[PDB]
Amino acid sequence: YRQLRLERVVLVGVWTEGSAADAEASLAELAALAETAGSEVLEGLIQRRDKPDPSTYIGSGKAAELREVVLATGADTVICDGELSPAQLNALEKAVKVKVIDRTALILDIFAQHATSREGKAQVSLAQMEYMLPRLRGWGESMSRQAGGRAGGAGGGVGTRGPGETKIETDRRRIRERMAKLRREIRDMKKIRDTQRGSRRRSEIPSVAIVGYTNAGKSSLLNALTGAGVLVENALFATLEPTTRRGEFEDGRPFVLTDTVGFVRHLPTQLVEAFRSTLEEVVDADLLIHVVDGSDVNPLAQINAVRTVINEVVAEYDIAPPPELLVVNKIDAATGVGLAQLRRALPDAVFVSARTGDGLDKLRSRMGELVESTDATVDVTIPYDRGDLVARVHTDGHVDATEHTDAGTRIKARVPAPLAATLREY
Amino acid sequence: SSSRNGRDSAAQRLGVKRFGGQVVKAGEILVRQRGTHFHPGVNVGRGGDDTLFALAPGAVEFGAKRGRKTVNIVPVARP
RNA sequence: GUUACGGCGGUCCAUAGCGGCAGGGAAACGCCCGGUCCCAUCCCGAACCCGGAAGCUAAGCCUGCCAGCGCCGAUGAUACUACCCAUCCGGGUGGAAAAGUAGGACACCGCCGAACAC
RNA sequence: UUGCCUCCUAAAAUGUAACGGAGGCGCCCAAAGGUUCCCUCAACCUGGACGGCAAUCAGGUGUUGAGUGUAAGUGCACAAGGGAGCUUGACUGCGAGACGGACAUGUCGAGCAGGGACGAAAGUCGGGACUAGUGAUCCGGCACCUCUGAGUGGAAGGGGUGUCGCUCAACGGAUAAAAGGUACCCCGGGGAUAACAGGCUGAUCUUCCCCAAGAGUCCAUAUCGACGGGAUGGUUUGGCACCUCGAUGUCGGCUCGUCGCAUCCUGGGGCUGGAGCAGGUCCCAAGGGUUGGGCUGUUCGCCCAUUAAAGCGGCACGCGAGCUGGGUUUAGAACGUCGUGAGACAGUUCGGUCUCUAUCCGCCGCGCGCGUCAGAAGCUUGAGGAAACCUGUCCCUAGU
RNA sequence: AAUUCCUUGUCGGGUAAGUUCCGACCUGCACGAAUGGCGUAACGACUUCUCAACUGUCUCAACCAUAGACUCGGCGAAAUUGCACUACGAGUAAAGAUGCUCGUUACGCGCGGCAGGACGAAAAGACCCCGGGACCUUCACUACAACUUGGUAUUGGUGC
RNA sequence: AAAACACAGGUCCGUGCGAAGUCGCAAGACGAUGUAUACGGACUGACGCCUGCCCGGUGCUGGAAGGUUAAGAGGACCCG
RNA sequence: GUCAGGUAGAGAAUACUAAGGCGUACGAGUGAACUAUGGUUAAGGAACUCGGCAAAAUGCCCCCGUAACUUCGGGAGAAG
RNA sequence: AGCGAAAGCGAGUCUGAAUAGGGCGUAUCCACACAAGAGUGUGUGGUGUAGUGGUGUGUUCUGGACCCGAAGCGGAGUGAUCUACCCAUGGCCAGGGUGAAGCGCGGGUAAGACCGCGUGGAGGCCCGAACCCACUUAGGUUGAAGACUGAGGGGAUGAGCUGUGGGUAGGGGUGAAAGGCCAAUCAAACUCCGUGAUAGCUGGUUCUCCCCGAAAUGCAUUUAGGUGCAGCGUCGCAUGUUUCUUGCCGGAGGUAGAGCUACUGGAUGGCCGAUGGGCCCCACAGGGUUACUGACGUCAGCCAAACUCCGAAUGCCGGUAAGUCCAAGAGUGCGGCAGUGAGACGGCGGGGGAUAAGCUCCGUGCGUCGAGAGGGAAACAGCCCAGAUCGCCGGCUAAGGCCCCUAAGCGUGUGCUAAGUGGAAAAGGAUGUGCAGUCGCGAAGACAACCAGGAGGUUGGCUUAGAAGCAGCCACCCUUGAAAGAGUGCGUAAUAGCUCACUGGUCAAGUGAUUGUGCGCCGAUAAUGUAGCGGGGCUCAAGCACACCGCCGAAGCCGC
């Protein structure tokens, strides 16, 4: 994947719709994303165009204004907070005369560096490659001056000219073909996920999952709510693969807790396609944990954006959406006095701090509550010749083991179907 | 889209012309140099472009001074 | 002849140089005491130049010790190398460093001798 | 990019190429030249009114790290570096001997004479510490001259000496003076040079591996395996230009096949995070089999129905002296864009001749001849080869 | 869109399934008003889609008759041609071998067929590069025709 | 063999009459035994609704006060 | 360029013939493959293919009956 | 008789003030003086000078100029019997439909408007033969035919088709416009002439032997496949060893290597540690604490094509002594005649590339091919041996070889290999097998073996479902010293079995880790047929290592 140098960036963006504050909010993510890729951000100009221009995104003169600013700060790059066609980002290049590479390209590239597992790498190349298919004539240097042609076409006879096809076709065929090999390769990797999750599938276990946008925590809540220390870097997209750990409350059934990748607003609809791991999870769960930051200007926004992606998932798979708990974090350490507003109308606005300040007590006790129904309950008369009746009676996941006697034991507990099962003889 | 180099000068045929022990005439050029890498000794002058030349017949005999080379001439002494 | 001043010796110009400690003043070398005269300072008799001869070896200069800092430096190995031998590696016959080690070294010789004898 | 200067490549003389690696030059100075005499920096320490840390003045330490008009190298403290007083050799007539060298150019010169400058005189001085700061010849201009003067006297014109005129910068300079198109094209050549295929290589491609940080409810190795490392193959995009330009016909499809195994089904196993039904991996295995349609010129791809399965590749990206001609790639025409314009597009759209009686090898069938130790005939052995090799649903065992 | 690279844009019809087709949207890489804009009854061996009827186009081929092909008698050519009692495999060579190396296979000569090879035959490559032509264009150079301006000759007199 | 050319219908420009235009060095001829409701050139192409803004560039047409400039007239001054 | 018989037929089409003219210059065989031109086809009916290319189908007279649209003529031999 | 631009002078002359240097001349040689050794000058005597015209041969100039070959340019003519358009005068269009204007009569209107029914016969109208075209398909494609045929197809009273006779001509015609047509030819026809056009391009160039024998390099080029000059070849003349090789002697260098406290850059850890940030007392007077940073300094370990305090070997320049010397067929100067100026691969040193290529560009008293036959590499220009004057039915050898193909060894002595390794390969994996030392136990019978040895407070904690020796784990100062640790691992949720550091009668040599030291194993893997020894075959070596002995083998060397 491409790697050169920048660190000099002037960001641009059309404010087609949204409130003023809402508008600069987007430009801001772009700053955080730009820096998460590691490059100094200089200026940043936004226009108000009811709809972009088919040749230069922002305008004609505004392009001219950007031309001078690029000469001023010498910024070697310009990033646009939107998705732009091959043509728009090629015209704006002869104008400013510098990088005019859009947002989807920043995110697709951050994913190249930050991602480790081989699988994660493959899915990336697909994305980057699907993003580069629609940009071949534009990067038409291979066709730049490929005017060496004029091949005679007397035809109906010797031409010996092998190209029996135009160069654009032959070239397009290659990129499209590679894309197809990778396509079958990625779909196979599905079997590896499934096989690495056979034990969990069987022995039915609970399965809470943690959805939520990037930088909201998630991997802080996991590193604390259970145990374990996973990358908890304060940057963007710090988890490029799902993790799962065990933990439980009174019902020791695993409450297996998964951590996932982050759903930013306006996914690049590319690399995300193959980020199915996070979504395979959302589908097969007993609860979800939308974590939102209170140190955010408007928390409600990410709530809806994120919820939308969850919407599409439930739609394709035709599922009764699982119970979902939204837990606010960054509170307490809440760099937010806008705290009360959420509290006025926000469910489970626990002052999770995850850092110092804890706050996890209420959640844990209110976590098992929403998980799917348990299914083990039992009171029995066990003879003194146990030594075996303990089957799992005491030694089980949630086995209650909460009543006793002198006669063997008038145990009064809970037992799963495949464990103590029916064996219990009252 | 190319190299910004590719221009050289010509090779000026410098260096020592007459080596030691070689019988020489009046006015032959002994050394063509740029600085004074060889300083002139007895019966040897220096030109305008710092070349050394003979001032008398003899035999060129390299030597030394206080920390610097010299190119001398010893007379050849007809028998 | 002893010999404590010159000029180049002139040295493949530090084995010769710096730095310490102890000494010297016959003639000479010097600091020195003043500028009237020849002549001088981008300002100054500091220096350059002139006239001297009251003191005194403080310094320059010379002599003897110091291996302290720098400086030369082997023998033998090693690198490298010309030619030859070798199917892949590597060898043989010649030449041989650099850095280190043993050590050397507080210079040595010329001249009317310059002075100083007898 | 094209001429000149400097360094490295350049292999301890000189020289040495590439679209190898770095820089400068088409000037400046009437003193920054000549000569006589004097001086020694940069930096550091101890001190000030600024004055920083760093501006002028003190005392030390300091041999070269400063400075040299300007790139780099070679030099230069003996100074070629800093300062001062006069001055014009930044001359005229010459030049023994040499360097470098296809030639044309280019370079260094002791020394003799005339007239000078500076020095006391010894002497130095024909520009600048050196090496770049430039243009041949032709054709003309100008000043001076003890040359010639188309019968003679003059004159015009010519001649000599000094000298002036060019980004002739494509810088050894075809003319004093010069841009484009050709798909309407033609001729002479070239596999000395490209497109197709083959050959070498294997960056990119593809298939494996070595170490084991992690993942996998716990757990490196059931299943994956990052950062790094080592390779196979020759089916991709390339690199090179070795055969072919006195012709090696070029994509997809049809018909016909043959081969490899890196196996899609069917057949054996080992390990399973294998209860059973189903699976997931890895090993062995190439005998047979591996569908029909919609869209597209399409290979590929998506979709509709199925099946035990709807394998991947090689054979001039198998196969046009076997077929098609949708596509690409001639001449007609139109759109968008570029050009003042002929015309262009590596954009689109409509339309556009597929030649040949099989000589030799090869392959499929079929005769004639001779041989097999006398001439005939009936019935056979089998060394050796060829052909075939697919698979499903339901029932009972057993709702065990 | 005969105009849209991205592009099989998005939505709706049509089909079991529609990179083509029809109707809309509009973000017109790069529509636009006599190089005319938008419509339009009739017309087209023009281009592109759908349907009814029909059929060997096809699933999947079979049979019959003529003209050749084949045999016999007569007449009787052609392009091509360094040779010749012109195998195959793995190699090696100007890197793709009937002719070279090592093996393997194969009695001699014909007839009807098939087209994998002889880089098969034909035409001193139409493509590419170099050199030379030709015709075309222009604000390339230099001329000329044609058109135009003044003097002067033919061409003169009196006035002011 | 077409979506191309032509076409009926449009508008602009030129032409006052051996016209303009064309062939020809010239005479001459066609235009036409025609006369602006006619003839030549350019673009568009039945029919319906329409044809918007710009005269800076380059052309074409119509102008004059100055500047610039050829041949021909002029002959001071200089020279042999 | 000129004549233009008879039956069917609207016809100088097409089928068969009169008058008239020919058998037109290599033949005889023979159920090979294959090629060309004709013929027929079970059940299915575009599934073939770039594409209904080719082939099949419709076809005449006499009564009925005829849509959107229209520049009022047409479309129209609509279709059935 | 020359010098000079020239007037002019003349064995001299020109430039210059020069009686002073030079330039060009006085054919050349010998002798004698005076100078000068700055390379030799100057005078005096002698000897004394060679051209020209025929003609053979080799190059060369102007001519077609060794021969063959363009597309195209110019001058004068010929073509409209084909085709494009036009002018004059004739001819042809079977059959069947539809029904415009006009007119008449009725309806209708102030009237007009129109609507029915007759009559009429219009139209670049409709269906369709002759006729004229040429849209689709199939056949032909050394054809029946240098553009046709069979089926279908378009127009067919018109901008129609056709006959006869005319007109327009080549930079011109004609064109409902295609760069179309103008006699099977057209982005400028055909014929004759200039003409034997011109091609830096392609092809061809004919009898023999003897001697010598290249080059694919440098510079310049409207130049890069051409040419000019130099380099290399040959023939003639002149000089004679000047050439080359080896030894010794005299010199300049800055590569290989090395070094860095010797410069300029890079650069790894420490140590002192100002100078600054946090905190500092927040006075900015001021105590310093410092996970920071700490210039310089300093200790130790490093690197460089464009770093150098140093610095070879060879190579180069000169001198000197020899050698070779009936030959290298050496060097140098001047002439006649050339060719060559596209190099290839291998060894060593380098650039470009990915320190890829049978890649590309340089260096190399380097090699071979080119221009080189013979023998070995299976075959195989560039590798190894060796340079072919001819003949032989003689001998010795080089590289390479000796089981059979295939000439000569199934040679001799001592060891290794089990893999057909020999007869392809990597990181790496690994209880193969010989060697050589080392380390404890060490022919005590140690080691192996049959084996008594089974929950020490052993359900400990960390904690309690139990934490059932034993989920996990952070320690084994521990002994009648026996051979089980607060019992670890397989197991075991719990039982319950046995060892992990471990051992007693029976008693006959074993435990590791090194050199990696030899040889071996796996990794290992394409597509027509064994196919990675040339074939058969070889371990009963015909494989590998070290010694030893013969022989075979070329156009080399010898013999005749």
Ligand SMILES: Nc1nc2c(ncn2[C@@H]2O[C@H](COP(=O)(O)OP(=O)(O)CP(=O)(O)O)[C@@H](O)[C@H]2O)c(=O)[nH]1
């Ligand atoms: N100040 C503050 N920050 C908090 C608190 N809780 C969590 N965070 C922030 O959230 C971050 C941890 O969550 P993070 O791991 O970034 O979530 P994530 O979604 O996995 C990041 P990624 O996008 O890579 O998936 C930390 O950087 C931390 O600063 C809190 O209570 N206070």
